[PDB]
């Protein structure tokens, strides 16, 4: 059904596909990323996505309370998901703040990243059109680093709080506040524009990318796997957790979304179409990103792995460079950053609404007493703004990288996806879950879903976790910056805040229940009505 796609496809795709996947793929050397990416997509991604929507429809209890009807012991999965959402909402909006700053900087006769006659540029700047004719730096890269970001020399040096970036964060949070409070969302005739425009802009950037002199050398780097050397655990964890991040699984937002749907519909085809569409747009936009990078390699006369940032700044370096190469660059820069703001804001609205309704159910006697709901929304937005304010400082990039690596990705998604699949397959029961799916949608999942939940997803999550611990290498920003041990510990604390929820809730519910230990366990394993 055309409408069934059009309504939700443009909101399910978000900044993950356009921004995180290109930067993670570039960080891991291009073609080697795609092998563990497609292994996780079909081994785990589509099966765990189908699993979470089924839980949502089956329980109709939201992202947290759903586990009471499946396995009371593992209710901590809901709290882990809700704190993953809480951490994601703090850092994800910083990308919209950067996009907003870029959009206001676009209102010029000449784009500021197109040249470096400007005051913020180092004497090492050389225009890319002349560079190939040393330690030279590109005007776009040091624009990113010094005007927008003001990159401090380390996380130990927070520096000054950037007032412009703080006001951009305030602007986006005000927009989120009013849209969530008033319930504004694309449902009128504007949905067609909101869905079509991102794909149109992506296709325009694709055609600009593929036609630039060097696009083929960038598409070689993007598709040729380094199978003989690249199989470190970092590429396995990155590629695996990118699938879980892009599908918004392990967040409990999928269960919440499914809780508002009637359990009498063909879930399977809709989930398989939405997931294959999302992974398709990610993979396709990869061609544009890497053909822009491969053109930059041929213009500047350096290797494709050295043209740009092995980090979040990849998109803010590549796409501005692309729109610099187009007729009337101001128009395309403005359109690109409006597209980015729309695509990020829709996802942010979904995630904040999911967080709000998840947290309201934990105290409806005070969190839902009429306008107390608006008060709670304002409190959540203010707290998230004050938390994001730490990343507006000159050293905010390192905090942002730590948050992206640890707080809502990596081992925590592997942990949540492993416990979901393990509980449903083994503790609750694969036969029970398949019978329930029969009752709802009319047919059993079949062997692929059954064995993906029973073996493949647990084996992939445990293999990636153990390989990460056995062959541990620490996080870095870009290619060379090394985090201090205290910042690594902070990132691991961010991750453990989500991970520890399951053991903590297990021991709490064991404490809360009377009777002998085995009777407690039997009581807390059996579902409630």
């Amino acid at each position, epitope marked *: 059904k055309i409408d069934f796609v059009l309504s939700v496809a443009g909101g399910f795709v978000g900044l993950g596909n356009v921004w995180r996947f290109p930067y993670l793929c570039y960080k891991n050397g291009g073609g080697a990323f795609l092998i563990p990416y497609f292994i996780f997509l079909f081994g785990s991604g589509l099966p765990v996505f189908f699993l979470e929507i089924i839980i949502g429809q089956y329980t109709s209890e939201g992202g947290i309370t759903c586990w009471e009807k499946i396995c009371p012991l593992f209710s901590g999965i809901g709290y882990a998901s809700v704190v993953i959402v809480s951490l994601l909402n703090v850092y994800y909006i910083v990308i919209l703040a950067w996009a907003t700053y870029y959009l206001f900087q676009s209102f010029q006769k000449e784009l500021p990243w197109a040249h470096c006659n400007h005051s913020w540029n180092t004497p090492h700047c050389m225009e890319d059109t002349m560079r190939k004719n040393t330690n030279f730096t590109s005007p776009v890269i040091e624009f990113w680093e010094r005007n927008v970001l003001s990159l401090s020399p380390g996380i130990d040096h927070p520096g000054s709080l950037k007032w412009d970036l703080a006001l951009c964060l305030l602007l986006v949070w005000l927009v989120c506040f009013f849209c969530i409070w008033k319930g504004v969302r694309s449902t009128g005739k504007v949905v067609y524009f909101t869905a079509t425009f991102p794909f149109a802009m992506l296709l325009v950037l694709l055609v600009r990318g593929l036609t630039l002199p060097g696009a083929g050398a960038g598409i070689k780097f993007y598709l040729y796997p380094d199978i003989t050397r690249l199989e470190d655990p970092q590429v396995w964890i990155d590629a695996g957790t990118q699938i879980f991040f892009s599908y918004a699984i392990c967040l409990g937002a999928m269960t919440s979304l499914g809780s508002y749907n009637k359990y009498h519909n063909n879930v399977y085809r809709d989930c398989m179409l939405l997931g294959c569409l999302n992974s398709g747009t990610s993979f396709v936009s990869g061609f544009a990103i890497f053909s822009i990078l491969g053109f930059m390699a041929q213009e500047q006369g350096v290797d494709i792995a050295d043209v740009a940032e092995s980090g979040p700044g990849l998109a803010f370096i590549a796409y501005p460079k692309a729109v610099t190469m187009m007729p009337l660059p101001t128009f395309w820069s403005i359109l690109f950053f409006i597209m980015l703001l729309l695509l990020g804001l829709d996802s942010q609205f979904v995630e904040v609404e999911g967080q709000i309704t998840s947290l309201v159910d934990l105290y409806p006697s005070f969190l839902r007493k009429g306008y107390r709901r608006e008060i709670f929304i304002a409190f959540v937005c203010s707290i998230s703004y004050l938390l994001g304010l730490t990343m507006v400082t000159e050293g905010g990039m390192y905090v942002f990288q730590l948050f992206d690596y640890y707080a809502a990705s990596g081992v925590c998604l592997l942990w949540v996806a492993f416990f979901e699949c393990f509980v449903i397959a083994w503790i609750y029961g694969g036969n029970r879950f398949s019978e329930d799916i*029969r009752d709802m949608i009319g047919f059993p999942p079949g062997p692929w879903m059954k064995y993906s939940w029973a073996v493949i997803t647990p084996v992939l999550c445990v293999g990636c976790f153990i390989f990460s611990l056995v062959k541990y290498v620490p996080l870095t920003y870009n290619k060379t910056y090394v985090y201090p041990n205290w910042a690594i510990g902070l990132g691991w604390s961010l991750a453990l805040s989500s991970m520890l929820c399951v053991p903590l809730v297990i021991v709490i519910r064991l404490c809360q229940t009377e009777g002998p230990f085995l009777v407690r366990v039997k009581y807390l394993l059996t579902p409630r009505e």
Partner: antibody
Framework: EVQLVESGGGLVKPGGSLKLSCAASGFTFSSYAMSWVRQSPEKRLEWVAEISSGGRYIYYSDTVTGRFTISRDNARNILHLEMSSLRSEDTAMYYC????????????WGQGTTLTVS | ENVLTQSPAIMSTSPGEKVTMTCRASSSVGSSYLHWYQQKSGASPKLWIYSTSNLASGVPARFSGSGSGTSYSLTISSVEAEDAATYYCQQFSGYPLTFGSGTKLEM
């Protein structure tokens, strides 16, 4: 997926009770939902009851909802139907049908047993 | 209960002629949840068409099915002696399950 064989049909007085049986073979009976379908002497097909593959979900038609009790023995691959109070209108031939996929329907039908009340 | 009705209660037909049998529903039935069954005289019914077009394992290709919403039909390109049987439409979209009144080919 080969064979189904009903048993237990016969003659009982109105208001009596009877228990039908349906044996299964050639497939994993525990993995398939089973249903009873009823054909009146007027040849009209009427659905009676459905039991899920694990027996957790059970449905009845409104005309038998209070009087009939479907059950299954996954360990023996035999399906059962229990009737408490047979009215005059219940006389018919009963077929057990394999109905695991609602989008595909009743793949296989047993030979059936005639039930008479008078 | 979604009552299903079939119009041509009896069809005396000469061999080789095309035949179409209509099925009508009191309520909207999903296309995936309507099926057709054949029943030869003196034998148990057998699945014939499912999901409104998908022919069963043993049904000859001469049979076909079409429909949507509250109207459904089964067609035969050319009837024959082997096709003389009673055909029932059935909805699987919601309980209680209901079968159509059934139509018998008479020649």
């Amino acid at each position: 997926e080969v064979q189904l064989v009903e048993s237990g049909g016969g003659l009982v007085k109105p208001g009596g009770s009877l228990k039908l049986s349906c044996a299964a073979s050639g497939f994993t009976f525990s993995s398939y939902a089973m249903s009873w379908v009823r054909q009146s002497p007027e040849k009209r097909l009427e659905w009676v009851a459905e039991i899920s593959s694990g027996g957790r979900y059970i449905y009845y038609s409104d005309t038998v909802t209070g009087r009939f009790t479907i059950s299954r023995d996954n360990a023996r691959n035999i399906l059962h139907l229990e009737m408490s109070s047979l009215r005059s209108e219940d006389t018919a031939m009963y077929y057990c049908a394999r109905g695991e996929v609602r989008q595909r329907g009743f793949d296989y039908w047993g030979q059936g047993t005639t039930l008479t009340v008078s | 209960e979604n009552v299903l009705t079939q119009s041509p209660a009896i069809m005396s037909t000469s061999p080789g002629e095309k035949v179409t049998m209509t099925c009508r529903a009191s309520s909207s039935v999903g296309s995936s949840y309507l099926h057709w069954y054949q029943q030869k005289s003196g034998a148990s019914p057998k699945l014939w068409i499912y999901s409104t077009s998908n022919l069963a394992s043993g049904v000859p290709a001469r049979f076909s099915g079409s429909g949507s919403g509250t109207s459904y039909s089964l067609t035969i390109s050319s009837v024959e002696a082997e096709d003389a049987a009673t055909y029932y439409c059935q909805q699987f979209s919601g309980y209680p399950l209901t079968f159509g009144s059934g139509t018998k080919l008479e020649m």
